[PDB]
Amino acid sequence: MNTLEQTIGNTPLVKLQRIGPDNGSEIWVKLEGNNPAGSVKDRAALSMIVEAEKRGEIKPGDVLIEATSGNTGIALAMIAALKGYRMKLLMPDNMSQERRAAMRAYGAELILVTKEQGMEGARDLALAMSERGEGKLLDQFNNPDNPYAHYTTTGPEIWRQTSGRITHFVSSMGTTGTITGVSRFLREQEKPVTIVGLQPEEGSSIPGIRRWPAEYMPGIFNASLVDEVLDIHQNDAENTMRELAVREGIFCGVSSGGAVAGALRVARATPGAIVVAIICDRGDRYLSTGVFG
Amino acid sequence: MNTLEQTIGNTPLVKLQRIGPDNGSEIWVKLEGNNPAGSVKDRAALSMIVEAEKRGEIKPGDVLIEATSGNTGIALAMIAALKGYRMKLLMPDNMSQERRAAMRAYGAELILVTKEQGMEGARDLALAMSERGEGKLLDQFNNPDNPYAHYTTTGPEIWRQTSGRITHFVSSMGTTGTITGVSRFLREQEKPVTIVGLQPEEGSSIPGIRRWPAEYMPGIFNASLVDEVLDIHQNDAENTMRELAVREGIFCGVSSGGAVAGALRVARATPGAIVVAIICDRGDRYLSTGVFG
Ligand SMILES: *Cc1c(COP(=O)(O)O)cnc(C)c1O
Ligand SMILES: *Cc1c(COP(=O)(O)O)cnc(C)c1O
C-alpha cells in the first residue's frame, strides 16, 4: 500500500570499508535503524500484530498490552498509532522522561509499576490483564510471530542481498527472534551458513539484550538453530560502536557495536568469510546516555 | 557500490491516512529522516563534497570547514567520516552537550567561538580560516551544489513517486536548497505545479529554519521559483508535529510539523490537490527539548 507500513523492512545491507582484517573476508551490516521507528523491533511489532489480525484475535480499536520500554515499546506504540490500536505499555516507574517520551509521542498509554516490582512485576501485571480480558498480550519472548517476521522478511532479504554468498550470520540476542527467524530461513538453503549469536559477558551491560540464565532462554529460542554463542564485553561493544561512527560513518547503538565486534572476531578467524551482522538501531537515542560523549 | 553512501536519497513518499480534509485532496510526505544521519541535509552534504571532488578542489584527507551545529553539521560530519575527510565545524559555545555529541560521534572537530561572537562570529571565523588556507569552506547558504542535490535526486524522485500527479509542493525553508532544487526540476515539467515555501511567523522559533530578512535571502534562493510563501506559527508547527506521531505514527521534527501544517492549509483551500510536503528529519533528536513528551 501507500502507507508508512510499507517502509518497514527491506533495510539496506552495506559493506564496511575500513574496519576488519585484510584477509579476504567481508563484513556487511544490515541497517535495521532504517525502519520507521528506528530499530529492528518494527519488524516483530508489525508481525505480531498483523498475524493476530489474520487470526481474528484483534481488530483496530482493540487494546494491546506488553511489558517493555525500549525499542519494543517504541515499535509497538508506532504500529499501534499507524494501524489504529490502543497500546498499553507496562514498565517500572524509574524510566527517564526521554525514555518514556519516545513511547508517549505515539500516543501509547504507559502503565507504571514500582521500581521494586521492576520489569518482572510489569510482565506479571501485563499477564494478569490479558487473562482478565483487558487486552491482547503480545509477549515478545514467546510469540512465534516475532521470529516469523525475520523468517519471512529479514532472512530472505539478506540471502537476496548477498546473492547467497553469506557464510556467517551474526546477531546480538535479545528476544532471539531475529537470530531464530533468520536462521530458520538460512537452514533451508543448500549452502551451509554458520549462525553466531552474541550475549553480554557476565557483568556487562548492553542495552537491548541481556545474558539469559543458561536454562532460562526466551521461549522462541531454539538452540539447534544457533551454531555458536559468543560473549561480548560491554566495553568492547561500546568501542566498536564509536569506531563505526568515526571510521565508517555508521552511527548505531551499543548492541550494534557488539554485533560488529563479533563479526570482526569471525572475520579475523576465517579468511574469506562473508559475514553479515545485524545493526539493531541508530545511535540517536543513545546520545543522552553519554556512551558517545 | 555497496557503501552507506548509496543509502542517501530515494526516501519513501507516503500518504497521510487520517489528518487532512475529506475533499478529494491527498497529502503525501517525503521522509527525509530516512537518510543515513537522519535528515534532509545528508543530500546537500553529499552533493557539496562530491561535486567539489569532481572539480579537483578536494580529496580524501583534506580539511572541510563550515559554521553550523544542526543537521548540516551532523550530515557533514557523517559524510566526512564516510568519505575520509577531516571535518571542522564552527559554532558559539552555547551548544548543549547532546547537540555537540551528535557531531563529535562522527569524529568531527568542533571549534568554538564565544556566545558574544555567536553564529555570525562563527561564520566569520570559518571564512577567515578558509582564506588563510586552513580548509575548504562549504557555505551551505551560497553553494550551488546544495540545490543541485535536490534538482537531481529529490525532485526527480517526487515526480516519479507521485507518477506526475503532484499539484503542490510544500517546503519549510532554511538554506532554501530543497525548495529551490525541487522547484527547478518541477518547472521543467509540462504540467504546472504550485511551489509553496514556509517560513516562521515573526517571533516564532522553529529549529532548522529561520525567518529571513526580506531582502537578505540566502544566495542560492531564486524568488521566481517559489509561487507562495506562507508563515507558520511555532505553536501550530509543534502541534501538527505531535499530531503526526499520534494519528499517523510518523515521528518527525518541528519544521516537519510546520510543513504538514502548511500542506493542510493548501489541501483545505484546494479540493483535489495532490500535495507533497518534505518531512525533514525524525523526532529523535528533539525528545530532549521537551517539544514532545
Ligand atoms: C531487540 C534488540 C536486539 C535483539 O534483537 P532480537 O530479535 O530481539 O534478538 C538487540 N539490540 C537492540 C537495541 C534491540 O532493541
Ligand atoms: C535545513 C533544514 C530545513 C530546511 O531545508 P533547506 O533545504 O535548507 O531549505 C528544514 N528543517 C530542518 C530540520 C533542517 O535541517
| Nearest alpha carbon to residue B106 among B148, B157, B136, B71 | B71
Q: Are B174 and B26 in contact (CB under 8 A)?
A: no
Distances (CA, A) of A97 to A75, A115, B6, B293: 17, 15, 35, 8
Q: How many angstroms separate the CA atoms of B134 and B126, rounded? A: 9
Q: How far is CA A49 from the centre of its chain?
A: 16
Largest CA distance in chain A: 58
Strand, coil or helix: what is A277? Answer: strand
Q: How far is CA A98 from the centre of its chain?
A: 20
Who's near B281: CB < 8 A, 6+ residues apart? B32, B33, B38, B39, B40, B71, B208, B252, B253, B255, B256
Helix axes A71-83, A97-104, angle to 10 degrees: 20
- Quickly count: other Cβ atoms within 10 Å of residue A229's Cβ: 14
Number of A/B CB contacts below 8 angstroms equals: 132
Q: Looking at residue A213, what DSSP letter applies?
A: P
What H or E segment, with its residue span, contains residue B200?
strand B194-200
Q: How many angstroms separate the CA atoms of B141 and A190, rounded? A: 55
- In short, whether A175's Cβ falls inside 6 Å of ligand 1 is yes
Who's near A187: CB < 8 A, 6+ residues apart? A193, A225
Chain B neighbors of A100, CB-CB under 8 A: 293
Chain B neighbors of A31, CB-CB under 8 A: 7
DSSP per-residue letters across B85-140: -EEEEEEES---HHHHHHHHTTTPEEEEE-TTTHHHHHHHHHHHHHHTTSSEE--T
Q: Which of A46, A150, A169, A178 to mutate to test the pocket of ligand 1 (most atoms within 8 A of CB)?
A: A178
Q: How many angstroms separate the CA atoms of A221 and A146, rounded? A: 11
Name the catalytic one among A171, A204, A255, A256.
Answer: A255
Strand, coil or helix: what is B84? Answer: coil
Q: Are A181 and A190 in contact (CB under 8 A)?
A: no
Helix axes A71-83, B234-248, angle to 10 degrees: 90
Strand, coil or helix: what is A161? Answer: helix
**Residue A15 sits at the chain B interface (C-beta within 8 Å):** yes
Q: Which amino acid is at A134?
A: E
Q: Are A267 and A273 in contact (CB under 8 A)?
A: yes
Determination technique for this PDB entry?
Answer: X-ray
Catalytic residues of B, by residue number, are 41, 255
| Nearest alpha carbon to residue B102 among B286, B291, B292, B293 | B286
Decide if B245 and A288 are in contact by the 8 Å CB cutoff. no
Q: Are strands A26-31 and A13-15 parallel, antiparallel or unpaired?
A: antiparallel
Strand, coil or helix: what is B281? Answer: strand
Q: Show the cell assigned to B272.
A: 483535489
Q: How many angstroms separate the CA atoms of B211 and A206, rounded? A: 43
CA of A215, closest CA in chain B: separation in Å?
37
From the list B82, B282, B288, the residue facing A38 with the nearest CB is B282
Name the catalytic one among A30, A41, A83, A88.
Answer: A41
Query: Could you tell me the domains of chain A?
Result: 1-34+154-293 (3.40.50.1100), 35-140 (3.40.50.1100)
What H or E segment, with its residue span, contains residue B184?
helix B177-187
| Nearest alpha carbon to residue B200 among B165, B244, B233, B169 | B233
Using the mean position of ligand 1's atoms as its centre, give its distance from the Cα of residue A75 in Å.
12
E strands, chain A, in order: 13-15, 26-31, 63-67, 86-92, 109-113, 136-137, 168-172, 194-200, 228-232, 274-279
Decide if A106 and B251 are in contact by the 8 Å CB cutoff. yes
In ligand 1, the atom with minimum distance to the C-alpha of A207 is 13
Report B:85-144 residues touching A (Cβ under 8 A): 97-98, 100-102, 104-107
Helix axes A254-269, A234-248, angle to 10 degrees: 90
Q: How many angstroms separate the CA atoms of B288 and B293, rounded? A: 9
Q: How many angstroms separate the CA atoms of B211 and A277, rounded? A: 45
